[PDB]
Amino acid sequence: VKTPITEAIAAADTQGRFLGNTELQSARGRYERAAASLEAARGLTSNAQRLIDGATQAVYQKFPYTTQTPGPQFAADSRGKSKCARDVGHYLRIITYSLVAGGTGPLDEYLIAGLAEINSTFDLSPSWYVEALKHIKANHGLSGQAANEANTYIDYAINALS
Amino acid sequence: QDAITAVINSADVQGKYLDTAALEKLKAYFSTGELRVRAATTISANAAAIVKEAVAKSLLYSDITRPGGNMYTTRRYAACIRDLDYYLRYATYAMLAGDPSILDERVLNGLKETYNSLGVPVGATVQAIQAIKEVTASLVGADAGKEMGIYLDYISSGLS
Amino acid sequence: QDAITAVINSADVQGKYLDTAALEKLKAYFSTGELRVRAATTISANAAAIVKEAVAKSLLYSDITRPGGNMYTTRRYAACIRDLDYYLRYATYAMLAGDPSILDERVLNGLKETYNSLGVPVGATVQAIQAIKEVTASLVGADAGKEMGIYLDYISSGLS
Amino acid sequence: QDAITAVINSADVQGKYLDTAALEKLKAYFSTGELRVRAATTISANAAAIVKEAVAKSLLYSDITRPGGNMYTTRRYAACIRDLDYYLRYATYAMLAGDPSILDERVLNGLKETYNSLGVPVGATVQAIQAIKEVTASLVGADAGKEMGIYLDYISSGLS
Amino acid sequence: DAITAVINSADVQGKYLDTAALEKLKAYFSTGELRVRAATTISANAAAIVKEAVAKSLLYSDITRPGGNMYTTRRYAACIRDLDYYLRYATYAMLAGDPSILDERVLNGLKETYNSLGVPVGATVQAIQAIKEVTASLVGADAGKEMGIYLDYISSGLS
Amino acid sequence: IVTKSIVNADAEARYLSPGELDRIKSFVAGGQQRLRIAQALTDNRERLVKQAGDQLFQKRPDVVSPGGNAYGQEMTATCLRDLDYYLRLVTYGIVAGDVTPIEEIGVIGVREMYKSLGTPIEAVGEGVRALKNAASTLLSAEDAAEAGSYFDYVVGALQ
Amino acid sequence: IVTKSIVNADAEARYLSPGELDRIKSFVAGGQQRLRIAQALTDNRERLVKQAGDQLFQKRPDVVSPGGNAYGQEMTATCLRDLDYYLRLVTYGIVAGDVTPIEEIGVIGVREMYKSLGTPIEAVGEGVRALKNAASTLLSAEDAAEAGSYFDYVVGALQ
Amino acid sequence: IVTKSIVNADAEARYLSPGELDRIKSFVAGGQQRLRIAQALTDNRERLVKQAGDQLFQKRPDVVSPGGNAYGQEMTATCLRDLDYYLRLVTYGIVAGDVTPIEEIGVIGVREMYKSLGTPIEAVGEGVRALKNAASTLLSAEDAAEAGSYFDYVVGALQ
Amino acid sequence: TLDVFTKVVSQADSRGEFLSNEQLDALANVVKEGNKRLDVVNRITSNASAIVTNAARALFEEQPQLIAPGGNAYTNRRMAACLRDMEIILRYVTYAILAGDASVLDDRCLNGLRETYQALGTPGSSVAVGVQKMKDAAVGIANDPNGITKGDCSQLISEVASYFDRAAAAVG
Amino acid sequence: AIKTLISAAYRQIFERDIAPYIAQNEFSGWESKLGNGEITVKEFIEGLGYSNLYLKEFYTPYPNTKVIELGTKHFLGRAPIDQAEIRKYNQILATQGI
Amino acid sequence: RLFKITALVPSLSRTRTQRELQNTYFTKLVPYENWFREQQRIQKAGGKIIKVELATGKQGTNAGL
């Protein structure tokens, strides 16, 4: 799992040398933005049920296909729509994890590590999630600087999808 | 009463003119009135959804709606919905006034007398007002949900 | 009061002598006193086991003994055991007297006032007295368990 | 209760451990305890002088100490001094505890009942507690006089 | 206390607390630290101390057999509570640094009480000595003998 | 400890005597060390319950044995939950500085509760002793002394 | 029943009642049958005590578990001696008609005693219940009701 | 503070609390500074008493008025001796940490005494307040807080 | 490798729910305390070689069998290996100081470390003597105020004494 | 009978058993002096009120007038007669302890 | 601190059919504070006081009782 503190560790450990001043400034930088990212963390957990059910409906509006045709892949049945809030409910968790971790670490392992191999099997089209996140990108309602850094991890998961 | 009317009254009973602390209080009220009005609008939007979600959180599928409970009869269920709508509406009025005196004057006056006369359970009412407070603090945001929860907790504390 | 003392009182307030119906009542009491005494002895045997089995049946592993419940604090658990021992002991006294007046005079007098003052849950108490009644009706037999359950259900009905 | 005991109770009834907000509350109490103890010492110094100055400010040379007033009889003057000493002493206890619950539990419980039973004037008592508050806020300083006046105004507000 | 004893001795003299009394007070403070630590470690396992003492001294004898003073169940419980007392009041007299409170508390009437009830004295002295050994093994050397001074004061007052 | 002095001076008609004000000022001074000790016991709770269950079930295997109470996963989970409760009350007593808010919730009626639950109280006392040993290993010397204070109170209370 | 009747009429200022004299007459009339029951229980001392103790160890294996109190030959011999003592007190109570011999020899302070001995109360009580069942199987039927009801007093008073 | 802690734990059935043992430890740690304050007040006996008495006669000239009590050389010498007595009791209370030496030597029955002597209470109290101000000016600052708070107890308890 | 930021993640991931605002406020100490972490490691590694060579004279002060002939720290290769391992603990300690949680030190320094002393013959319990003879010099260098403005790092300092106490206890 | 009378005064002053309600027994000295008969029952009842458990039960959660009525209910067995009877007890709870 | 008293108090009211043998003749330990008024009660009831003894206290103790 990646963290700008643990990047200062593993780069110092493979060299076999101590923690010089050139790794302490790496952790120094995270502290400056640590306060900033947490304001984006409180902005998302307060809007948990608002963003999920807003973005889940935002998929069905642009894609009326997945609500109609029968199949285990789509969400014509309620168990599809129940698993709809499973995925996008799990998407906003790791985005809130990646902001509190300060890095792309938990977003790397938990979400995008094997994501290109599941979607080839279960017929989950990645264009579904990539525009689910675009609704979260626009409707999180954050402002200031934390609106940019919460926007950073969203379109990092987009480039992993596409 | 208002927060404005309370400030004017506190300056009046001394015979004092409006000094700078009272002007600070009035200017703080005139700063907070923006989110006060926006919160009152979105609470007036979906009050029935808030009451429905609150009874689904706290009171439903208990023994209270079972026979023997106080919400078994359907007129008693309708009276329960009426009382929760009253608590939410008067908390909206106290939030927009910025002063809890209307809760003391119109709701909390003889209410424990009535609820001990009818045999209404008080703790279930307190938990229902708590569920109301959680639902509207989720719905309106944290920043106005604090002021909504202050007057809802005022009703809950005076009820107990 | 007794069943004997109740029969004597009902004959006294009329100025009536002891007619044959009162003698029938007293002779029925003198017939049933055998199993009354035997039931009171075996209930006095293992009252602590009955209370332990009753809380293990009804109250344990619920939310009541969890934090937030009314039996969370250990002094409140001890007060719960005390109240259940009171219910069983006074039900034993009312069973041996054959008249529920001592329950009305010593237990059920101001008890709902106390339980609504302290916030004690009433339905869980009723359930606990029900579990007491099932355990002692199993322990004593059906024939004396009927008379034990009559006074325990009297306590449960007056409590509600 | 304390401020410490209130924080522990509020953390206990949720089953919550001591989170950082409760530790902030306890550390603020441990910061303010210095001036709390110093204020309690100098109020315990000259309580009789404070009560004497308060009756000389508010109650003396009125109609209350004239015949017809409630402080005319000398046992009633002694009872007045006793009540003012009670208000000052329990306000000292509530100041050092940092929690007004002992005022609610020991002073303000059945006090309006007593003062309306005896015919004691309430407004003159409120003005006497106000004069007590002004004298001790002058005597102790502004920084501890604020916390002394909070509990004395609590007694005055609950009395009215 | 030892402090109130120093103050009372100076008060009967009618003078103040100068350097001899002050040095006694400094001595009392220096031993008071380890006295506090010994009070904690005694209040830890007082029940185990009384249990080990009665198991070492009083059990499997003639007094616990039928025809003895400790035969009956209420008499055995009175024995436990009396030894529990002797330990608790020796702890108090250790923390005061002064045995007069201990004397005034129990040695006032326990002689006449054990006379009238027929309680044997020497078995109590043996039990108090067993308490002294158990607490000296449990606490330490110097706090153990500080405890043993007041326990031997109790045992000498009963005799 | 402020409620103790307040009800202590409140039974009397006198004010708070300034020696009590000195002890309140000293407790106010030591409150920061109290808060650090409580947070150190707070964040490391599951280690302490693990090592307490370790040392207890090594010491007394009858709770593990099927005749004992803590037999099976559900009963042993309830056992470690009881040890968690007692560690929580010990942290409360560490912050409060005096054993009133821990005795009010864990001590005052515990014997009849554990008697009508079937569990022995001596095994609970050994569990709190194991908690004291594990916290003594976790803390420094002046911290382990001040934690073993209230742990010692609980161990003496359960017996 | 004579001592209890005399002290009950002693608390009042009056003599013994005709009802109480009927009680003494009926007790005298049943006294010979009570001596027969005491004869049977005296002569069946061994096997009753051993069957009751082994029924106890069948029900409760915690005492003879190595964490338990009755671990070892000597400890289990004292266990059987305790059951012997209680059967002796039951015979005394069957003869007297009162429970004051049972009470003031073996009931009145037994909880504090077995708390200080480390022994569980409920296992004593289960052993006396096993004695009740064994002596109920040995005797005649309503005679066993008589014996088992004094046993029932001992069982309910121990818990 | 040891006597008060012992009698407070005596009113209960339990030992000394860990909180109270912390109180005794902190009192021992501050005891040397308290002996220093007692050293300064012992050595400044003369001028403190004379300055306080003359401050009293500056504030209250009624006592040295010919209608007053302290009229004449002998009466005013006894006035200064009373102030000497109270300063001595203040030093005792500073050393002990309790106010029980101040109380049971000079507080407990002083109102009835000075009522029967014809002496006003408030002038005694004003003289002890003058002693508080003088000893506050002599000592170090928070050391003077310590001395003046015991003086404050004497002043509030006299009125 | 773990952190105080990522153990909170993995504690919340095994629950599988969003982090509460009660949770993040406790984490907001660390972004304030990151001012205090970042120089206490800088204080140790600046004086790293002074700690090692001064504590090389402390285990060798008390136990002179180690340069006795036939000792286990006896020869030059062996004594150079002692200094090779006298500061291999300090980098793994200062990694845990910066990370704030000891999961780096427990899988790289102490994971199976005790096993080799039962394999080689070098005394395990003697290393635990000299390791907590470093921490009185490590804390004593990290605590004293010189130049830096006064602040309370005592709470943070206990952590540093805990990591040496953990590493010494899991060796001997 | 002495054990009965020990539990008796607990029942009269406290309307429950006192032993569920206290950590330690606290009455070992008072029960010892009762069984030896060195003190009478009146001195035992007076000693029951000096204990801090009675203050914790009937004095700290209650105001002064309710403590007057509860104290005369527990010890005297009756409510106070006149207002002057309340006044003298208020003076005694005023300038002195409970 | 504690007095050991022994006193008799006769019955100058009507005669009682219960004993009051503990109440007529008694020996009890009374604290020092209550002893003055309790003595004064026996002074009032016209009873003789036979034996007064200081049980715990020492004479002439100025501090600490």
Ligand SMILES: CCC1=C(C)/C(=C/C2=NC(=C\c3[nH]c(/C=C4\NC(=O)[C@H](C)[C@H]4CC)c(C)c3CCC(=O)O)/C(CCC(=O)O)=C2C)NC1=O
């Ligand atoms: C913790 C991070 C995490 C995520 C997000 C995740 C998603 C995930 N979603 C899945 C299936 C699914 N995903 C969806 C979701 C959708 N399909 C639709 O029709 C909608 C367009 C869309 C929701 C907006 C549905 C309906 C299934 C079931 C499809 C099937 O069973 O074939 C599957 C395969 C089967 C499963 O275990 O349920 C995975 C692994 N797994 C993870 O470990």
Ligand SMILES: CCC1=C(C)/C(=C/C2=NC(=C\c3[nH]c(/C=C4\NC(=O)[C@H](C)[C@H]4CC)c(C)c3CCC(=O)O)/C(CCC(=O)O)=C2C)NC1=O
């Ligand atoms: C504006 C402030 C205000 C309130 C609150 C108010 C309450 C109120 N609630 C009533 C009944 C009731 N109130 C309740 C309410 C409850 N019982 C429960 O079990 C729940 C805990 C709780 C609902 C959350 C119920 C069930 C009744 C029916 C009793 C009956 O009519 O038979 C009644 C009796 C007559 C009637 O409803 O029309 C009044 C006056 N009046 C007021 O002017």
Ligand SMILES: CCC1=C(C)/C(=C/C2=NC(=C\c3[nH]c(/C=C4\NC(=O)[C@H](C)[C@H]4CC)c(C)c3CCC(=O)O)/C(CCC(=O)O)=C2C)NC1=O
């Ligand atoms: C002889 C008839 C009689 C009864 C019943 C009685 C009850 C009684 N129960 C009480 C408290 C209590 N009663 C309960 C009992 C319960 N709460 C629950 O959650 C359960 C449903 C129920 C137990 C089955 C509890 C938990 C308390 C503790 C409240 C407290 O003291 O903080 C109190 C307050 C003071 C005290 O216990 O000592 C009284 C007077 N008094 C009587 O004279």
Ligand SMILES: CCC1=C(C)/C(=C/C2=NC(=C\c3[nH]c(/C=C4\NC(=O)[C@H](C)[C@H]4CC)c(C)c3CCC(=O)O)/C(CCC(=O)O)=C2C)NC1=O
């Ligand atoms: C904070 C104050 C507090 C205390 C003290 C407390 C005790 C407590 N212990 C319980 C059970 C239990 N307690 C234990 C105890 C133990 N395991 C053993 O062998 C040892 C003797 C001991 C611990 C090491 C066991 C085995 C049970 C389950 C017993 C059963 O299910 O009958 C229960 C009933 C189940 C429950 O609701 O948790 C309570 C209420 N509860 C509280 O709220």
Ligand SMILES: CCC1=C(C)/C(=C/C2=NC(=C\c3[nH]c(/C=C4\NC(=O)[C@H](C)[C@H]4CC)c(C)c3CCC(=O)O)/C(CCC(=O)O)=C2C)NC1=O
């Ligand atoms: C006549 C009234 C009377 C009783 C009841 C009595 C009991 C009694 N039981 C003892 C020990 C013992 N008692 C038991 C008892 C038991 N094992 C269990 O687990 C069961 C619950 C219980 C069997 C009923 C054990 C195991 C010991 C040995 C404990 C030890 O040696 O420390 C001892 C100490 C050693 C001795 O003197 O024998 C006494 C005095 N003494 C009396 O004079």
Ligand SMILES: CCC1=C(C)/C(=C/C2=NC(=C\c3[nH]c(/C=C4\NC(=O)[C@H](C)[C@H]4CC)c(C)c3CCC(=O)O)/C(CCC(=O)O)=C2C)NC1=O
């Ligand atoms: C250690 C405790 C203690 C105290 C306090 C004490 C006081 C005390 N003050 C006395 C007289 C006196 N005390 C005063 C006092 C005063 N003049 C004023 O107006 C002022 C208010 C006040 C100075 C503080 C005077 C004027 C007399 C002489 C009165 C007379 O001789 O009748 C006497 C009688 C003569 C004597 O024996 O000295 C006593 C015993 N004795 C004690 O043992």
Ligand SMILES: CCC1=C(C)/C(=C/C2=NC(=C\c3[nH]c(/C=C4\NC(=O)[C@H](C)[C@H]4CC)c(C)c3CCC(=O)O)/C(CCC(=O)O)=C2C)NC1=O
């Ligand atoms: C990763 C590279 C890095 C380091 C090393 C670093 C350290 C660092 N420590 C600071 C402050 C400080 N550091 C300390 C530390 C202490 N004072 C004591 O007396 C204690 C003994 C000791 C803690 C044990 C204190 C007290 C301050 C005061 C300012 C503050 O609170 O940050 C600051 C505040 C800003 C400044 O000094 O310019 C810096 C930069 N910042 C960085 O970017």
Ligand SMILES: CCC1=C(C)/C(=C/C2=NC(=C\c3[nH]c(/C=C4\NC(=O)[C@H](C)[C@H]4CC)c(C)c3CCC(=O)O)/C(CCC(=O)O)=C2C)NC1=O
């Ligand atoms: C078996 C082969 C072998 C050798 C030779 C050896 C030498 C050796 N000499 C040492 C120190 C030392 N070596 C010397 C020797 C000298 N310093 C001087 O001032 C003189 C110029 C010079 C001697 C002529 C001294 C005085 C010390 C102690 C220095 C210190 O403690 O810092 C040390 C480090 C500490 C020690 O364990 O004592 C080693 C390892 N080690 C080996 O394993």
Ligand SMILES: CCC1=C(C)/C(=C/C2=NC(=C\c3[nH]c(/C=C4\NC(=O)[C@H](C)[C@H]4CC)c(C)c3CCC(=O)O)/C(CCC(=O)O)=C2C)NC1=O
């Ligand atoms: C707190 C200071 C204090 C003490 C110590 C005290 C002791 C005391 N011990 C007593 C009895 C007793 N004391 C014992 C003691 C013993 N038997 C032996 O063989 C041993 C030598 C010794 C046990 C180690 C016994 C057996 C009885 C009861 C005798 C009887 O049945 O009358 C009694 C008579 C009432 C009773 O408790 O039953 C008192 C008052 N009272 C106090 O106030």
Ligand SMILES: CCC1=C(C)/C(=C/C2=NC(=C\c3[nH]c(/C=C4\NC(=O)[C@H](C)[C@H]4CC)c(C)c3CCC(=O)O)/C(CCC(=O)O)=C2C)NC1=O
């Ligand atoms: C600790 C809280 C507490 C309070 C306050 C309290 C008050 C109290 N005040 C009383 C009387 C009184 N209270 C007052 C007081 C006043 N009347 C006035 O005119 C003034 C406005 C005011 C004084 C500032 C007077 C004059 C009486 C005398 C009535 C009488 O006894 O005839 C009485 C009647 C009996 C008695 O004094 O002894 C009580 C119980 N009791 C308490 O437990």
